[PDB]
Design a protein around this ligand. Structure first.
Ligand SMILES: Nc1ncnc2c1ncn2[C@@H]1O[C@H](COP(=O)(O)OP(=O)(O)OP(=O)(O)O)[C@@H](O)[C@H]1O
Ligand SMILES: [Mg+2]
Length: 323
């Protein structure tokens, strides 16, 4: 079956998804921050990426922003200018620089009324993030099942304490890639084609990486997989519990059969290996510690055992229970 679980998944889905109210306020916040960027640099543009842009936003979602500008004009200079205007226009935060990369983190708003805990990361010419977002965006437009499946997984990972990059587990982005990897290269029939391996894929080099994928979405045949949201979620939890091999294998979008060893890629941290689609040198699972992996796997198994329990009624609610 999975009929009751599907029903339940849709019920939690509507409680966790960003409302139209929060969405509209986040979009007003952006209008504001753009006015501040105009007063500093007329030519620079401010773009959003991440969950809000792709449509994979939970409630209480942080904003991920990037400033695009002429690469020849140096980004440490106008970053600071932007920071000072944000401060002056009533924003609180930090101005930072890891290596050569400048970052502003806005932590609060004291005047324009976007919250006492308004959280917002601003980068400068982080072009790859935009592209990563385009990819996730396109997939979301391709199948109506993706979006609810992702937010459920994110909610799950957050609830199970397995969604902390700084504490030895995996980022949200990392979980989205695992979802996509499952939907493309594991489930049969596949729910999604691999857009990066499309015959129609035009090459586009950005910052040294090929960010090309097939974006003419309308021309793509709909999925010949007809599984319910529940079925898919069960398949997902089953695959990473029992089938997938973290020690030998890499989650990839560069192989037509999704088959990649850690060794081919030279990834002997690499406890969990997820190859970023475009920034292929970047391992998204790099934050996953040894004990982090144990917990991540333990949760994948428990989730499978639950969904497969014979003790009726199945306490589906325990799929989302704190720690
Ligand atoms: N571990 C990572 N490695 C490389 N790039 C990342 C990583 N995590 C995030 N990013 C980039 O930053 C963006 C946002 O990161 P984040 O993990 O906040 O996900 P998100 O899409 O904002 O959703 P949420 O905010 O709910 O986690 C992504 O679009 C991605 O391009
Ligand atoms: Mg974010």
């Amino acid at each position: 079956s999975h009929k009751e679980f599907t029903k339940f998944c849709y019920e939690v889905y509507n409680e966790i998804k960003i409302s139209d109210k929060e969405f509209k306020e986040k979009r007003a916040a952006l209008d504001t921050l753009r006015l501040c960027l105009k007063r500093i640099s007329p030519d620079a543009e401010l773009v959003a990426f991440g969950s809000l842009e792709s449509g994979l936003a939970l409630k209480n979602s942080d904003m991920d922003l990037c400033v695009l500008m002429d690469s020849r004009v140096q980004s440490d200079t106008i970053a600071l200018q932007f920071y000072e205007e944000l401060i002056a226009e009533g924003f609180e935060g930090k101005f930072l620089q890891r290596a050569r990369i400048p970052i502003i983190k806005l932590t609060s708003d004291t005047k324009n009324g976007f919250g006492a805990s308004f959280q917002c990361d601003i980068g400068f010419n982080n072009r790859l993030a935009i592209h990563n977002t385009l990819l996730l965006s396109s997939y979301t437009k391709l199948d109506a099942r993706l979006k609810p499946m992702v937010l459920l997984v994110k909610h799950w990972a957050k609830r199970k304490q397995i969604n902390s990059p700084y504490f030895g587990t995996l980022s949200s982005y990392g979980y989205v890639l695992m979802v996509l990897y499952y939907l493309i290269h594991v489930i049969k029939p596949p729910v999604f084609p691999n857009l990066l391996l499309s015959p129609l894929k035009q090459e586009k080099i950005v910052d040294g990486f090929d960010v090309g994928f097939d974006d003419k979405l309308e021309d793509i045949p709909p999925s010949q997989n007809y599984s319910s949201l529940g079925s898919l979620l069960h398949g997902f939890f089953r695959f990473y519990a029992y089938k997938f091999e973290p020690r030998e294998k890499v989650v990839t979008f560069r192989r037509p059969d999704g088959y990649l060893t850690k060794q081919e890629k030279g990834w002997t941290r690499y406890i969990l290996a997820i190859e970023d689609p475009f920034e292929i040198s970047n391992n998204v699972g790099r934050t996953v510690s040894s004990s982090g992996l144990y917990r991540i796997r333990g949760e994948f198994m428990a989730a499978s055992r639950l969904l497969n329990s014979r003790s009726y009624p199945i306490p589906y609610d325990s799929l989302f229970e704190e720690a």
